[model samples]
Target: APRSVDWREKGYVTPVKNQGQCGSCWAFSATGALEGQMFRKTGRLISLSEQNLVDCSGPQGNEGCNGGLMDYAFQYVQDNGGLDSEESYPYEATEESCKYNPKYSVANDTGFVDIPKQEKALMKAVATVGPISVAIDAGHESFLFYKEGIYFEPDCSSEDMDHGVLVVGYGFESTNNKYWLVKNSWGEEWGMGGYVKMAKDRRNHCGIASAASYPTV
Candidate 1:
């Protein structure tokens, strides 16, 4: 297996989340992608805390949990001394008032570049380094599923802000085909512990589909 498509063999699993009816899927995608990548890079499957990014990551740019960018959130974690595990902060998934363990989840400055199209770099960073943040047309009902294989609609437009997720890595299927295995924030019951595998290089959606990443180190 090539370094760019052998993560599955290493056992990099997505998180089992309880959405709790909150649209904070952006936070879930950000942390979920990072946590999984952290596991791949450090071999530590320590649960990461999304609540820290949700409540304390300054103002929710896309209020009502409707939408937000992942690169920004990832940077927030790095500059703020990194985030704790859901075990420490726990995720209600719902937006809450910024008040609790001050040290548990504080604020910081961290961000990544806005690539117009860098799917290769995106997948490379994710497969070798860690999870890469990505956005997609989650506005479709098909995404609200939990199965195997890539499930993206070709007609997907770039302006769609329907759903967001994290691209953990790439891998070859039983048929010797490549696919991007993504980790979502939706409840695990949604898709293989909140994951969706889309065709690799099929439509060049690797990172162009609203996907981005932060420097883990």
Candidate 2:
């Protein structure tokens, strides 16, 4: 079994951020994975451009400001050489013309891999690889009012995934409940400092393991 790990404490994860009102959670998820991988490889934390993805990754089947998939975004980065830094191409939270400049690229991905649709496989991926991008059904009322504790909404459907997020790490609390440390793009005021401890091993609650993926640098 893989030992418990926390990417945040290991300095592989960045501070939590907000995606505003836009349905650009996918971009944030991709960015988080890229940032984590970049940090692990280079010992430097670089905030990649989600706005660049929001604007330029449409050809890869990504819809700006509406929604997208992290896998597609990863492929976009791989094919397009790389992604720019946030300082080079700042996020506007709205759709705009493609303003991505290749010269501003700060990082790139060689490829990406989709984890097997199993909780144990997902945990192994996180422990051996890094943070992984995951999608979940975040449209539930309980998720919105999530204050603390391992979130387990029986009403949430695994087949109803509609939001993208990052799984930075996992652990078992004192209550003996195992949880995944999920990073949301809903801002620092939401959940636990813009993070959520989601119930794990519940058949991939909210389809978290169904579409889990991560980038390789």
Candidate 3:
């Protein structure tokens, strides 16, 4: 593994997506992680659906547009035998009723594992395994208005991981600026075109690795 890894450049990551006004960032995080694995396993890039989990996975602990967790979503996928594609189920951004069609399930995971909440372990997973789903504070306005610079919040609420995102890659561009290339579900117009450079090796800054995990394709 190179000390640095960028899955986006490897054709593994799908284009950045938006979770909309809903609090379904967890659904986006879940789909983003599995999308990379599906591509790695089948050599085909297909967008999975966030609406699938948002609508149907509530029984497994996910609430539509309210909030959810990536791990529970993966479990729901495994339990359902598979998940639907974005085109089949699609993303309406709002929390609607369940309308999943498994016949369109282009991807499924056997299981998943946490990355031990450490920068080195998280890097190894992204570099050698694949992209990972991670949770972060995503602070108030600081993160909301992020343009392009490396994101490092000084007053992040650290205790509560408010939003979920994916750590698509990481690198040490300079001795002083090692960072994680994160994919947000805030649409292409936000962040660096729907991406953020999260600070790495900074005590798990903003909890990037605190809840990191990825499905086993």
| Candidates' C-alpha lDDT | 0.61, 0.90, 0.88
Candidate that scores best on lDDT:
2
On lDDT, the stronger of 1 and 2 is 2
lDDT of 3 at 23: 92
| Regions of candidate 1 where Cα sits further than 4 Å from its true position | 1-14, 37-43, 60-64, 100-116, 159-161, 174-177, 205-209
Identify the superior model by TM-score, candidate 1 or candidate 2: 2
How high is the lDDT of residue 130 in model 3?
80
Clashing pairs in 1: 134-211, 135-210, 138-163, 146-190, 146-191, 150-197, 150-198
Sorted on lDDT, highest at the top, how do the candidates line up?
Answer: 2, 3, 1
TM-score of each: 0.77, 0.97, 0.96
TM-score for candidate 3, residues paired by index: 0.96
Q: What are the RMSDs of all candidates, in order?
A: 3.6, 1.1, 1.3
> How many clashes in each structure?
7, 0, 0
Q: Model 3, clash count?
A: 0
TM-score, cand. 2: 0.97
Candidate 2 lDDT: 0.90
lDDT of 3 at 177: 85
Q: Once model 1 is optimally superposed onto the true structure by TM-score, how far is the C-alpha of residue 50 displaced, in angstroms?
A: 1.4
